[PDB]
Every structure is written in structure tokens, then in C-alpha cells.
Design a protein around this nucleic acid. Structure first.
Ligand code: MG
Ligand code: ZN
Ligand code: ZN
Lengths: 49, 1337, 99, 90
DNA sequence: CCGAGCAGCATCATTACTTGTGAGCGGATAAC
DNA sequence: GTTATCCGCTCACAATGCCACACGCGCTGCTCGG
């Protein structure tokens, strides 16, 4: 993953039960923005037609 | 339209009437042109056109020409939809049997013919010969035969002897069977017959025949000759990217069977070699069997995939059949799914919503608002606009959902709250924000738990969702009237930190002119958030109804509490905010706010509480660092001590000075003591670790540590976890459950040695596996529950009865667990409750006992209240309002319609996930009451217990019993009665390994029938030298004294049997086996002395086996009728035993396994139901012996015990309705005036209405007996069947309802849900009563 | 993912399942029980008949709501017709009572 | 502007009858547009009906008698019109 | 000739530790 | 022997919900076919 500078404190309940609050910086630095590669296969059968 | 579902067999005529042709060829589709083949499983001619209003041959393509068949391919021209209903039929070349009526135990054919199912099986499959019509020779109409027998009778006779085999044999055999003749014949023969099981079989078969003749079915229909085939639509042949088609199993089975049929017919015309046609008929029977059911008689697994083919029955039964897959719960189409987050800025009734999901859902409402606004007067342009997301669409959506509620739903909806409503708001991202409190309601964590959404669209539905399932209307859990919306964590911490008191903090000692003043002071940083100060506050008060006095008092508080006071809504007195304000305190605050100020101020108060809690928690900065959880320094020492302790204990064993088991126990005990000491050390070093100073030397205040600010606040986790963290972790469990010698000396702030972590892993994995299984088990249990009670709906308003159950404050041998006020709260009393000022009517008999009533009750300290159950209500098909008592989740009495059955089943099944898988000492003062005892004094002036069910009670001076015990038999009583004694002052002691034969008159003792060697042996105390007679009973000894038994005599100063003083009967004592007797001849006796010292689950499965009411292993034999005990002819395999009532007739002799011991001697005299042999009790016996009130109190006690053990609470109403459901059937005692048979089980409600109507007339009612069935069976034997069809079996219930013609009127939640109409429970109750009052004449 | 209206299974005119198929949600047994625990009569009613069944009913609903009218036309769950036809595939005659 | 339904159910001593009557009223107030009694505030017909209910001027008997009075007005107006038309045959 | 479709198959032993419970049936076991 | 009694054995029948995702689903020597 990533080593993140993190503090342990409630924050207006935005981390109420276990939800995790982050900083737009972690997005601007792309610290977690990942990739996903997916394939699509178009086949060409040979119908009797 | 309709109001009932008729069901019965179908004549071949009927089946053929359903048909639209006779498919002949198995082939489905031409491949060179993908067209349905003529005379095939998709033949357009036989089913319908493949394309709408388009002939197959292309001769017509116009809607006008609809209705004319073609002439080049011959197919009707309609919409393609008709290919969904046209059923086909197959002419079976030979008759054949229907597997269902033939194998579903019990075989309907077998019962119909009084024939062994083995025989009918062996004759269907062509292996034997059944002779029919029984000609003049020695042959029968029903006898089976074999090959050699067959041809031997043939050589004996070529006629008057009709032996056949296979289907047509069965057909002709049924067809000539005179039904009503056999019926009345067996009828007149029934009362003639008296052998029990014969009578039972007779009445079963006679009921079958009577239902048959009453139904329209005819026996020959039970053998198919034409076979209907499903429409082509419902068994589709969907292709793939190429010529690959998903050949549904139905098509393949149909291909197989039609192939067999064609082949067999072609053989029939072709000269028919006999053995070949025989075997082919057998094979065709097998094939049609497999088609109707791939299950029985073997397997017909598909090719290339070693797994069975989907039978027709498969498409019905199981979790995949249409019932549990598309009828009951169907995949909805209209709304959404996502994962959730918190977003606490929003009010309690609101909820988040992603803009994308919103835009996708209300798309129809979007089009509507756009068209009505004319900005897009064509649906196409509407789609374009919503595809381009021009801001116009955005604010249009914002307007269109301004009040439009929606439904948030957890995945497993355990109880009623699992689905709730909210007014949505628009946010970004893809998550679903929601208020925190309600996420605690769902048991919805934020670990990635996904929630579904559901928009209600029709106006009635939207207004409904606003009225009922909006969160702001569900604060009291319907299970227990406790508030379900409780601030759980991360907000309780905030307040608890705020409402605390640091001794010398910045600002202590000031005086504040109001809460707003102190708030301004704190925000400007001029004073701490918690320092003692003096503030003036005007706690508004509702003295009389409607008024509001305002006392501007001057209270000493903390600025924290001063600030928090700004939220209470002019109600509650200040005294509710002045304390530390823990979690339980918050629940208390919310509850009293709700009770005093209605509802709306309370929801506002809760919202404000959550807001301010989050705010001041963030302002706090509560944070857990490693140095917070301070280790108690002395712990080490303690360990060593205990360690050194166990060390020398090992010496105690290494020197053999102590036994091994006591050594183990001693290790356990010293470790437990050291654990408690180290826990108290950790606490005492944590809870008050802070030491500070106020303008002076020093003070000791409660600790401000981060830990114990979460624990003591009750925020998250209790001390049972802290002491596990800081202090010693303690012992851990072996896989079996044993305890390891050496506990985990370590802790968590310190590391763990490998082995320590290993044992911790043992424990944790056990727990995890327990949860992982109990989840599914509890799911199945709660499903059975909701099924067996899916019909109870409060319909009448007052049954107008008087039978109630005696609700009493429960006592368990310790202190009172559930006070009477906790149980009887909110339930209408049965009869007038007398003030214990006897002949003072405290409360009348139709009073909804609410809180002020229960307080007026407990004031006068009543004993127990006869109260209206639900099992005692009298209304037919549903229970009356007043019997069900106070509706929970609200305050009013129940309203007519609440499907209390379902809410009760849910409330019971939900907490299932929280389940698992010598002396008697008084405790307080008061009298010493004794029940069921015949007290005779001893020579030692004490009292002797001389019965079997002697109950000790300790009552208080105020009249309520505080303690109770079961004082065993023969235990001496060292205490009188009314003796006000303190705790621990013993009343009775005894030894469990004895069972004396205490007398009731003094004098000497004599022997009678005391024979040495034959019936008794001579055994000595070889370790002291003493001697004794060992009475071995019949079997143990030689048979020459088996039939003979001994009798000891309580003789007077002479040697003559004396009569019981008080009556006119002798008293000599038979002593059982192993009776080790010492009393010599003619020796003085003590009054009540030991003549002979005769030597002597848990989790969810417990409640499961309870509700199933299954016979517990080794049940406690009870007493059917009273009398004197005497074992009959001994050792009939079992040990027989007759008991003769004082004068009641004793035609019964119960046989108890002599292996199993016994709890009653011979010369004993006790009434019915007494424990003849100790052990668990079968609830059936409880019912059938001591009524229904006894068994229902027993069940409620049992299950409430199992739930209290886990601390969860369930109001007794729920288990109460469940027990009312599991016994609604009754078995008939006599014939009665009407036509109710003997062994005919029938709905006790229907028996009640029949007896009611008859006793209204001149006749006399029919005598019944309340039966009892496990929830499963009690659900299957339901009046309606479609319910019981859907529920669990759906292959017996269908067959039975079919053979009996069970016309099913719905009147049930299950059906009305299935068929797709309204529900009798909710507003649908109003609709149905308006239907029955007007639309039903 | 969400679903306003779209594809429908062939064997039963119920919507498909799965984000891949743009399908709806499975309103299963326990959701039904939770609903009927409240009143929830009309809600459950329309959800069973007109939301995701009764092709004529749901088409009428869509066409009626776009005209700014919220009213249900509960007909018959097509899956129930399926069940009837499937039972009738066996000798088990099953009809609808006249009244 | 409605969040709760407490006083609403206080007006009709039943929840289900409450929602049913309110639903009928709102449906009338959407299709065949009647007059929203309480002044609306850009509010759906649902909350409008619930507010009318809590005001106390709408319930089962009141709604039914208003409907029946309007229906008898329709009766008398239809009678007048059709008799005037039968006179127009002269 | 040789590729493409096709028609009814236990494809020998294809085995198969329990899951827990209930009901029924063939046959041991005892009373009249 | 009868007659019913009960018992060992056999067989049927139940197994949380969702989801999501992935993967896969006749053949084979007869039939046909040119
Ligand atoms: Mg979770
Ligand atoms: Zn044609
Ligand atoms: Zn009643």
C-alpha cells in the first residue's frame, strides 16, 4: 500500500464508527489512484447461413 | 376476481382439454434455418407463432389478418405471447404411473389399496404379477404373484384368473374398486375393531377414502395415460453466440420420454415380442418417472456434467423453485444498490444519495416533470436531455424528490427495522450517506456493508412509507419497548468528556449569567471545557398538564454541562445533566425526554445531541497512545507469587502429598485469584491514576486517561476487555473446553510468547467458527418461525373472556431475575386484581396496565396477576386486541391489523445471532413456606421431608416471595416456619447419594419377606467390620426370588403392622434393588428415619429443540393417573409397572426400561403428572397431563431463561404467540354430535366453532383434546396449503391437497403475498374488511 | 448501480440480476417479512405486482406516472401464471375459484 | 413542511386508517385537482394531505360527506341539464 | 471419402464418514 | 399360533440471506450428406 501520515482522533463524527477520513492531498498525489485492465472478446462464429 | 384456489387431480379428459395438440417428434429446431420444427417441442402449429402477428410461412404479416390459421405451415396468427400458455399433451402409448402418488411416503396408492408399497413398486416395474377380479379359483383381487406362479395358474386356468403387470393392471384394479362401499364397510368395521394401531390405520384409510369420494377425483386418474407438456416459453431454448443452445433439462427429459413413447408404439404395431414390449414399458415408466421427478428410484444425471437433470418438481421445491425464488421473494427492478458512509451533518429523517443513482431511479418522474414543464414534450427528447444532464434536469430532479421518501435496506433484514424510509438528499460520489444512529439500528457497520435502496412509486405507497417506516416513527424496538435509537459510540465519548469535572481547571470558581454566557466564555478560550463554576439556570417544569413553571435557580455545575444544557427542550429538570453522563445515562435522558415531551421534541433533542457530541468530541481530541494503558507495576510481583505458589504445589504433587485432580483444581484456583488481584490492581491504578492540586496541596480525581474515558463512559468495550489489555490476559480454553494450567501471564501492551498467542488462537477460532455456523442456523430457525406464525393478525377487538395465565415474578433459586413489573408491564389483566388488603379491588379486569398502573401495583406489593394471554384469546382466525395487550414499539393498545405473528417471529429469531453453540441456604428474612410436603417430625426434634415435590419458599414481610428452592426427599429440616432468619442460615441438609424410606410413626421395625440369599444377600462393611443386607431386586438375584420382593414393617412395641395415624391404611415399605438396609429385627425406629440408603444444548440448538417440541432423550416419565405403585409381571424386556388409583380404574401398565432408574417406590400415593423418574420433560406430556397453561408457562420460562443467559431481552408476548401457534390443532376424544371421528386431528378453532354452533342448538359439543405439534408440522397441517406448499416440503402437501381436493381460501399473508393482492395485515386489513362487509354480500 | 426499467428474464417476466445485466435487486423473503411486519400493505403490494411483474401492469404504471399520476393497477404476477402452468404440467389440476 | 405524523395519528385513532384516508385525499388533490386547503409551500400532495389531516379539517366522515355533497350537486346539475335538453327536443 | 450432424448412452462400478431428525416397515419379542 | 409391540434399519427431508465476480455447460461411433 502506502505509508500515510495518520492521526487517531474523532473528527466531527466523519469517522463515526470505523469510516476513514482522508485529505485531498492523498488524491492529488495519486497515492491510491489505481488502474484496472479488462478485456472484451468479440467472436466470429460460422453459422450455417 | 377470484377468492380461492381449487386443486385436485385431473382426468385424462381434463388434461387433453388443456392441450393444443399432440407433439410427436422430439426434434426441436431446424439448424440450416433456425425455425421451430413441425410436430416438435416448439412446433408453432401446436403452440403459436414465433413472431407477433406473423405467420410462420410468411403468408401474413398484418394485424388485420389476426386469427386465421395459415395453410402452408398451418399456424394461427396472434401475438407471440400465446406461446406462454398453450400447453401440449403426449399420448403415452401405454399407461404409466405417477411417481408422486406412488412414492411420496406414505404411498397414496398403497394406502388406497391396503397394499404393501413394495408390491405395487414391483408390479409397476414389470417384475411380478398382480391378480385382479379374483375368479373362482384360489386367486384374489389384490394378491401379487410371480412368474412360475403365474404360468402355473395359467396351466390351471386360462380364464377366471386375470393376472397382469404394470400400469394397466393398477388402472383396472383401481377402476373397479367400489369406493363408498369399502368406505361404509370399513366404517362399520372400525368401531368393531379395537386394536390400537389397527384402529389408527383404519381411520387413516377411511379418511382418505371419504375425502376421495367427497372430492371429484377418480382413482384411475392417479395413473397417467396422457402427459401434459409445459408451454414452449417457460422452458426456453436460448442460443449462444453461435449454434450453441442452452438445452434446458426439461427439453432433454421430454426428448427422452417422447423417444421412448414413439419407439414403444412402433413396436406395438410391429407384432410386439412380448418380453420386449414388457421391458420397454418398464423403461418408459422409468423415463416418465424421471421427468416428473429425477429423484426417486435412481438417477438420470445429464451428460458431460455429472449432476442430475432439473426435474419438474425441482422447478418447484428447494430454494430454487418458483416459490422461494420468484413467487414469495421476486427480484425487484426499480431501485439501486450501493455501499454506505456516515455524513453526520444531516438530520435524523434524512439520508444521503448519489446524484447518479438518483438520476437513474426517478427517470420516470424526471420525464413527467419535464413533459409537464414542456421543456421536452417528447419522450425521445426527454431521454436525450437526461443523457446530456443539462442543469435544468438537475434542479428538476431536486424538485421532484423534494418530499419523495425512499427505502434503505440492509442485506440480511433480521427484524422489522431491517428496512426503513428516509427523505433523500443529493450528494456526490457513489456512496449512500445515512444518519449514524439508524446505522446502529440496522446493526449496520461501516466495514463496506452494502445497502439496497427502494423507491416507493404509487401515491398510496409513498404516503405509507412516510407514515409507517420513516425512521422518525420507529424509536422503540418492537421486540422490547426500550429505545432502539441509542447513541452508541464516538458521540457518547464526546458528551462524557464534556460533562466531566477536572478539579482545578482554568476558570474554576467563577459565576456565569446563563449557559450562553459560559459557552461564549469557553469558545473564546478563557476557560476550560470542564471546570466547576456557578451558573443560573431556569429549568422549565410541567407541574400540571400543559403548564410550564420556570425556576431561575442558581446551580453549581461545570461549563461543559452548562453548555450542554442549551439543548434540552424546556422539559427535563437540570438534575439529568449534572452527572458524568455516561452511555446508560444518555439512554435514560432520551427515554425520559420521550416519555415527558411526546415525540417531536425528542427527535429534535436526539439530533442536537448527536451534533454537539460530534462537535465536542472533535474539540476534545481523545486519542489512545501506547503509554496510556499503563501496566500496574506490581503485576509482575503478583505473578511471581502465584508462580512461586504453583511451584510448591508441584512439590505437593511431585512428593505425592496431594492427588492430581485436586492439584489441577488448586492451580486453577490460585491462578484465578491472582487474576482477580491483578485486575483490581490495574483498575485501582487506572480509574483514579490522576493526582492534581487545587490552589494547594493535592487531590485525587477520577482519571483523564484516554482509556477508561472510553470504558467508563461505556463508549466502546467494557473493563472485561481493558483488564485483558493492560493486566494479565488470564486463562484460555482448550478445544474441548478445558482450561490450560498456565494462563497467559503476558498482556497486550507487552508482547506474547508464541505458545500464548497459540492458545489465544484456539479460543478466537472457536468463537469465529461458532458465529460462522450460527448465522445460517439462526436464519433457518427464524424462517421456520415466521412461517408457522405468518397468519396471526389482530382482528377482533375484545374476545370477552376470563381465562388468564398467572404471571408471577420469576425466581430461580437465586435472586429474582425478572421482577413482576418487568413482565406484566403493558398487558391487559385477565380478572380483577385485588389489592393485598384482601377484598380490595386494586385494578379492574379490562385495564391496559401501563406504567402508572404497574407502579400503583408494586406499591401495594402484589403477589402475581392473572393476565390475559394470547393463547387464551377466543376469537376465531386471529386474536383479539385486548388479549395481545399493549402494542410495543408504541404506547397505545394494539391496532387491528398489526401482523403480530410476523413481528414476534422476527423479534425472536433476530437475537439468535447473539446465542452460542447437597445444601440449601436462605438469603434474606421472612417466613419459611413449604409446598407439597407431608411433614413428620424426627426423634431429633427436626422436620423430615416426606414427599417428592417439596418446594421451599422464602417470602418477605411485604408479602412477595423472595427466594425459592427444591428441597429434596428425605432431607431433614432444621428450621420451623415463619422463622425470620438472615442469609446463609441453612434450612435443610441431606446427601444426594441416598433416598431413605422414612416412616411416619415410631416404634420398632420388623422384617417381612426379607430372605437372605434368595431375595437379599449378606454384604458387610469390610473396611470397618459392620454388616448389612443388600436387597438386590428381581433381575439381579436368582429368579427363584425374582417374583418376590421384601417389605419392612414399622411395628409398634409388639411386632404388628400399624395403620397410618390419620387414615385407615397400613404402612409397610417395599424396598427396591441395591437397598442397603441396616435396621435389625425388632429395633426401635426414629420417626422418619433412613431405613435404606439407596445409592443415587445451551445454545441456539436448545431453543430449536424447544420449539420443535421433540421428545428429549430419556424424558422424565410423569404420572398419568394417581394411585399406588406396583411393578407388574417383571422383566418383560422392559420393567412393567401398574399403578392403581385410590378408586379410579387402572387399566394401564406403563413399561419403563429397568435399566433406567426410578423416582417412586411402590406404596407411594401421588396425583397425576408427578415426576415418576427425573429428567427432562417432553412438552407433549406436560400439555396432555397438566393442561395448556402449564406447558405455555414452561415454554416461556425455558426460552426466556436461554435468552436471559445471554442478556438479550424479549418480551413474553412473542414466544407467547408462538406457543399459541404450535398447538392450534386438537385431536378428538369422542364422536360428538357432529361427524368428527376419533383419530381425526383438526383445527381446534374449527372444533370450537362447531361445538359452539351445536351447543347453540339442541345437541351436545364434541369432546376434544389440545394437541401439540412442532412448528414444522404445526405449519404443514395448515388449513390453507399454498402457504404450507411454499414453506418446506412442497411435495407431500401438494399431493395431499390434490388427492383431497383442498379448496384453498386465502385469508393469509403467505397466499395474498404469493397471488399478488393486498395483505390482510396492514391497510390491506381495512381493504379486506370493506370487501367482506360490502363486496362479499 | 441502479435500475429504472430495462431487460427482463424470459422464463419469467422478472428483471435480470447483476450490475453486468443492469438488473434490479432481490427483494427476498426477509424483506417481505420486514415489510408485512409494518402495515406496508400498498407498498409491498405494488412491489410484488407492478414494480417487477405484470407486464401490462408495469407498462401501464410507466405510462401513467410519466403523465404525473401515481396509481397502481395490480393485475397478476406473471411468475404466478408460471407456477400454475408448471403445476398443471403434472396431473395436478389447479384453477381459480369463480367467486 | 412535515417531518413526523404524531398529531396526524392523534386526529385519526389508527395509523392504517390514517394513511388510507390521507392517501385517498391526496390522490383526489393530484388527479382531478381539488383545492389544497392548507397553503402549500411547493410540497407534494402527500405532505399537503397529511397537513390537512393534522389541521383537523379532513378525515373519513368529513371527506366522504364533502364528496357526497359534491356528488349530489353533480346529480342535481345533471338532472337540470338533461331535463332542459329533453325540453330542447320540443 | 470424409466431414459434419446425431440419438439415446450406469458412458465398468462408476464407491464415497455420519448431519440431524422423523416416519414407516420388516422382523425380533412377548402376551393370550 | 396369534396378536399385537416395539425395535433396528431405511429412506426421505431440511441446510441464512444477499450480493458481486469468475468459470463452465455432450458425445460418439451411428446418420447423413453430398
Ligand atoms: Mg459489516
Ligand atoms: Zn403459414
Ligand atoms: Zn381474546
Amino acid at each position: 500500500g502506502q505509508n500515510m501520515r495518520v492521526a487517531f482522533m474523532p473528527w466531527n463524527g466523519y469517522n463515526f464508527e470505523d469510516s476513514i477520513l482522508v485529505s485531498e492531498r492523498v488524491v492529488q498525489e495519486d497515492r491510491f489512484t489505481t488502474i484496472h485492465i479488462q478485456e472484451l472478446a468479440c467472436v466470429s462464429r460460422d453459422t450455417k447461413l | 376476481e377470484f377468492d380461492a384456489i381449487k386443486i385436485a387431480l385431473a382426468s385424462p379428459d381434463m388434461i387433453r382439454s388443456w392441450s393444443f395438440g399432440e407433439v410427436k417428434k422430439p426434434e426441436t429446431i431446424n439448424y440450416r434455418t433456425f425455425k421451430p420444427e413441425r410436430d416438435g417441442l416448439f412446433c408453432a402449429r401446436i403452440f403459436g407463432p414465433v413472431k407477433d402477428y406473423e405467420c410462420l410461412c410468411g403468408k401474413y404479416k398484418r394485424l388485420k389478418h389476426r386469427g386465421v390459421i395459415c395453410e402452408k405451415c398451418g399456424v394461427e396468427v396472434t401475438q407471440t405471447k400465446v406461446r406462454r400458455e398453450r400447453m401440449g399433451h403426449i399420448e403415452l402409448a401405454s399407461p404409466t404411473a405417477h411417481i408422486w402418488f406412488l412414492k411420496s411416503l406414505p404411498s397414496r396408492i398403497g394406502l388406497l389399496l391396503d397394499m404393501p408399497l413394495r408390491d405395487i413398486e414391483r408390479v409397476l416395474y414389470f417384475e411380478s404379477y398382480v391378480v385382479i377380479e379374483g375368479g373362482m379359483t384360489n386367486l384374489e383381487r389384490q394378491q401379487i404373484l410371480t412368474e412360475e406362479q403365474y404360468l402355473d395358474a395359467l396351466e390351471e386356468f386360462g380364464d377366471e384368473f386375470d393376472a397382469k403387470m404394470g400400469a394397466e393392471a393398477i388402472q383396472a384394479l383401481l377402476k373397479s374398486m367400489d369406493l363408498e362401499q369399502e368406505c361404509e364397510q370399513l366404517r362399520e368395521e372400525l368401531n368393531e375393531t379395537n386394536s390400537e394401531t389397527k384402529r389408527k390405520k383404519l381411520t387413516k384409510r377411511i379418511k382418505l377414502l371419504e375425502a376421495f369420494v367427497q372430492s371429484g377425483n377418480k382413482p384411475e386418474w392417479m395413473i397417467l395415460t396422457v402427459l401434459p407438456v409445459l408451454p414452449p416459453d417457460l422452458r426456453p431454448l436460448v442460443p449462444l453466440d453461435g449454434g450453441r443452445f442452452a438445452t434446458s433439462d426439461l427439453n432433454d427429459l421430454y426428448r427422452r420420454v417422447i423417444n421412448r413413447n414413439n419407439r414403444l408404439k412402433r413396436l406395438l404395431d410391429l407384432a410386439a415380442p412380448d418380453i420386449i414390449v414388457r421391458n420397454e414399458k418398464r423403461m418408459l415408466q422409468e423415463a416418465v418417472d424421471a421427468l416428473l421427478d429425477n429423484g426417486r428410484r435412481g438417477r438420470a444425471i445429464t451428460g458431460s456434467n455429472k449432476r442430475p437433470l432439473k426435474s419438474l418438481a425441482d422447478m418447484i421445491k428447494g430454494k430454487q423453485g418458483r416459490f422461494r425464488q420468484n413467487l414469495l421473494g421476486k427480484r425487484v427492478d426499480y431501485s439501486g444498490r450501493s455501499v454506505i458512509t456516515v455524513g453526520p451533518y444531516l438530520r435524523l429523517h434524512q439520508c444521503g444519495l448519489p446524484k447518479k443513482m438518483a438520476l437513474e431511479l426517478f427517470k420516470p418522474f424526471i420525464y413527467g416533470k419535464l413533459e409537464l414543464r414542456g421543456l421536452a414534450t417528447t419522450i425521445k427528447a426527454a431521454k436525450k436531455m437526461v443523457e446530456r444532464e443539462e442543469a435544468v434536469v438537475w434542479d428538476i430532479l431536486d424538485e421532484v424528490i423534494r418530499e419523495h421518501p425512499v427505502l434503505l435496506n440492509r442485506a440480511p433484514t433480521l427484524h422489522r427495522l431491517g428496512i426503513q424510509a428516509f427523505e433523500p438528499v443529493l450528494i456526490e460520489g457513489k456512496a449512500i450517506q445515512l444518519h449514524p444512529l439508524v446505522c446502529a439500528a440496522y446493526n449496520a457497520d461501516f466495514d463496506g456493508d452494502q445497502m439496497a435502496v427502494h423507491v416507493p412509486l404509487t401515491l398510496e405507497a409513498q404516503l405509507e412509507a412516510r407514515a409507517l417506516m420513516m425512521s422518525t416513527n420507529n424509536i422503540l424496538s418492537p421486540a422490547n419497548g426500550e429505545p432502539i435509537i441509542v447513541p452508541s459510540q464516538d458521540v457518547v465519548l464526546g458528551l462524557y468528556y464534556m460533562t466531566r469535572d477536572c478539579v482545578n481547571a482554568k476558570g474554576e470558581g467563577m459565576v456565569l449569567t446563563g449557559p450562553k454566557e459560559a459557552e461564549r466564555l469557553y469558545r473564546s478560550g478563557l476557560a476550560s471545557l470542564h471546570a466547576r463554576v456557578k451558573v443560573r439556570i431556569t429549568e422549565y417544569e410541567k407541574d400540571a398538564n400543559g403548564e410550564l413553571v420556570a425556576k431561575t435557580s442558581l446551580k453549581d455545575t461545570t461549563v461543559g454541562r452548562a453548555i450542554l444544557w442549551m439543548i434540552v427542550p424546556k422539559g427535563l429538570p437540570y438534575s439529568i445533566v449534572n452527572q458524568a453522563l455516561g452511555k446508560k445515562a444518555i439512554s435514560k435522558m432520551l427515554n425520559t425526554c420521550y416519555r415527558i415531551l411526546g415525540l417531536k421534541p425528542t427527535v429534535i433533542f436526539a439530533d442536537q445531541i448527536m451534533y454537539t457530541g460530534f462537535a465536542y468530541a472533535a474539540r476534545s481530541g481523545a486519542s489512545v497512545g501506547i503509554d496510556d494503558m499503563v501496566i500496574p507495576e506490581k503485576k509482575h510481583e503478583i505473578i511471581s507469587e502465584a508462580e512461586a505458589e504453583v511451584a510448591e504445589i508441584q512439590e505437593q504433587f511431585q512428593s505425592g502429598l496431594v492427588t492430581a485432580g485436586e492439584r489441577y483444581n488448586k492451580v486453577i484456583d490460585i491462578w484465578a485469584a491472582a487474576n482477580d488481584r491483578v485486575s483490581k490492581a490495574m483498575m485501582d491504578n487506572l480509574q483514579t491514576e490522576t493526582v492534581i492540586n487545587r490552589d494547594g496541596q493535592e487531590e485525587k480525581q477520577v482519571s483523564f486517561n484516554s482509556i477508561y474515558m472510553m470504558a467508563d463512559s461505556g463508549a466502546r468495550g467494557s473493563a472485561a476487555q481493558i483488564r485483558q489489555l493492560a493486566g494479565m490476559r488470564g486463562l484460555m480454553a482448550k478445544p474441548d473446553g478445558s482450561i490450560i494450567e498456565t494462563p497467559i501471564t503476558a498482556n497486550f501492551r507487552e508482547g506474547l510468547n508464541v505458545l500464548q498467542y497459540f492458545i489465544s488462537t484456539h479460543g478466537a477460532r472457536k468463537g469465529l467458527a461458532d458465529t460462522a455456523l450460527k448465522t445460517a442456523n439462526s436464519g433457518y430457525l427464524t424462517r421456520r418461525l415466521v412461517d408457522v406464525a405468518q397468519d396471526l393478525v389482530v382482528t377482533e377487538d375484545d374476545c370477552g373472556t376470563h381465562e388468564g395465565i398467572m404471571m408471577t415474578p420469576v425466581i430461580e433459586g437465586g435472586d429474582v431475575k425478572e421482577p413482576l413489573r418487568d413482565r406484566v408491564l403493558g398487558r391487559v389483566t385477565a380478572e380483577d386484581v385485588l389489592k393485598p388488603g384482601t377484598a380490595d379491588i386494586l385494578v379492574p379486569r379490562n385495564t391496559l396496565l401501563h406504567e402508572q398502573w404497574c407502579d400503583l401495583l408494586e406499591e401495594n406489593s402484589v403477589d402475581a396477576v392473572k393476565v390475559r394471554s394470547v393463547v387464551s384469546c377466543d376469537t376465531d382466525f386471529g386474536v383479539c386486541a385486548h388479549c395481545y395487550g399493549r402494542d410495543l414499539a408504541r404506547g397505545h393498545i394494539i391496532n387491528k391489523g398489526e401482523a403480530i405473528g410476523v413481528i414476534a417471529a422476527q423479534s425472536i429469531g433476530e437475537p439468535g445471532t447473539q446465542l452460542t453453540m447437597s445444601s440449601i441456604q436462605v438469603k434474606n428474612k421472612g417466613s419459611i413456606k413449604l409446598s407439597n410436603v407431608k411433614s413428620v417430625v424426627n426423634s431429633s426434634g427436626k422436620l423430615v421431608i416426606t414427599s417428592r415435590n417439596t418446594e421451599l419458599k422464602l417470602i418477605d414481610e411485604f408479602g412477595r416471595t423472595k427466594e425459592s428452592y427444591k428441597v429434596p426427599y428425605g432431607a431433614v429440616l432444621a428450621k420451623g416456619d415463619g422463622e425470620q432468619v438472615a442469609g446463609g442460615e441453612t434450612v435443610a441438609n441431606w446427601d444426594p447419594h441416598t433416598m431413605p424410606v422414612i416412616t411416619e410413626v415410631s416404634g420398632f421395625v420388623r422384617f417381612t419377606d426379607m430372605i437372605d440369599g434368595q431375595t437379599i444377600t449378606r454384604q458387610t462393611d469390610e473396611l470397618t467390620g459392620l454388616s448389612s443386607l443388600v436387597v438386590l431386586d428381581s433381575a439381579e438375584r436368582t429368579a427363584g426370588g425374582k417374583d418376590l420382593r421384601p417389605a419392612l414393617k414399622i411395628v409398634d412395641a409388639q411386632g404388628n403392622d400399624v395403620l397410618i395415624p390419620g387414615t385407615d391404611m397400613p404402612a409397610q415399605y417395599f424396598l427396591p434393588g441395591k437397598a442397603i438396609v441396616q435396621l435389625e429385627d425388632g429395633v426401635q425406629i426414629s420417626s422418619g428415619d433412613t431405613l435404606a440408603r439407596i445409592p443415587q444444548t445451551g445454545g441456539l440448538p436448545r431453543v430449536a429443540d424447544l420449539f420443535e417440541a421433540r421428545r428429549p432423550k430419556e424424558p422424565a416419565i410423569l404420572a398419568e393417573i394417581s394411585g399406588i405403585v406396583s411393578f407388574g409381571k417383571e422383566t418383560k424386556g422392559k420393567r412393567r409397572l401398574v399403578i392403581t388409583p385410590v378408586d379410579g380404574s387402572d387399566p394401564y401398565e406403563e413399561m419403563i426400561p429397568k435399566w433406567r432408574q426410578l423416582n417412586v417406590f411402590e406404596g407411594e400415593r401421588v396425583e397425576r403428572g408427578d415426576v415418576i423418574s427425573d429428567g427432562p420433560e417432553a412438552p407433549h406430556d406436560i400439555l396432555r397431563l397438566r393442561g395448556v397453561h402449564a406447558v405455555t408457562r414452561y415454554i416461556v420460562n425455558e426460552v426466556q431463561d436461554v435468552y436471559r443467559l445471554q442478556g438479550v431481552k424479549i418480551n413474553d408476548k412473542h414466544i407467547e404467540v408462538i406457543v399459541r401457534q404450535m398447538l392450534r390443532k386438537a385431536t378428538i376424544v369422542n364422536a360428538g354430535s357432529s361427524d368428527f371421528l376419533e383419530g381425526e386431528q383438526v383445527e381446534y378453532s374449527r372444533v370450537k366453532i362447531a361445538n359452539r354452533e351445536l351447543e347453540a342448538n339442541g345437541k351436545v359439543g364434541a369432546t376434544y383434546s389440545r394437541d401439540l405439534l412442532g412448528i414444522t408440522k404445526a405449519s404443514l397441517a395448515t388449513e390453507s396449503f399454498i402457504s404450507a406448499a411454499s414453506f418446506q416440503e412442497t411435495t407431500r402437501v401438494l399431493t395431499e391437497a390434490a388427492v383431497a381436493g383442498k379448496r384453498d381460501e386465502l385469508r393469509g399473508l403467505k397466499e395474498n403475498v404469493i397471488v399478488g393482492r393486498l395483505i390482510p395485515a396492514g391497510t390491506g386489513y381495512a381493504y379486506h374488511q370493506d370487501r367482506m362487509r360490502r363486496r362479499a354480500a | 448501480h441502479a435500475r429504472s426499467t430495462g431487460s427482463y428474464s424470459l422464463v419469467t417476466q422478472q428483471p435480470l440480476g447483476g450490475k453486468a445485466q443492469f438488473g434490479g435487486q432481490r427483494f427476498g423473503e426477509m424483506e417481505v417479512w420486514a415489510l408485512e411486519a409494518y402495515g406496508a400493505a400498498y407498498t409491498l403490494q405494488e412491489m410484488l405486482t407492478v414494480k417487477s411483474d405484470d407486464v401490462n401492469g408495469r407498462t401501464k404504471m410507466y405510462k401513467n406516472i410519466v403523465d404525473g399520476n401515481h396509481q397502481m393497477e395490480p393485475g397478476m404476477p406473471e411468475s404466478f401464471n408460471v407456477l400454475l402452468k408448471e403445476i398443471r404440467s403434472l396431473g395436478i389440476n389447479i384453477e381459480l375459484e369463480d367467486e | 413542511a412535515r417531518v413526523t405524523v404524531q398529531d396526524a395519528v392523534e386526529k385519526i385513532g389508527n395509523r392504517f386508517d390514517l394513511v388510507l384516508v390521507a392517501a385517498r385525499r391526496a390522490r383526489q388533490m393530484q388527479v382531478g385537482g381539488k383545492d389544497p386547503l392548507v397553503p402549500e409551500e411547493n410540497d407534494k400532495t402527500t405532505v399537503i394531505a397529511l397537513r390537512e389531516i393534522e389541521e383537523g379539517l379532513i378525515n373519513n366522515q368529513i371527506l366522504d360527506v364533502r364528496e357526497r355533497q359534491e356528488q349530489q350537486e353533480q346529480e342535481a346539475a345533471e338532472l337540470q341539464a338533461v331535463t332542459a335538453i329533453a325540453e330542447g327536443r320540443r
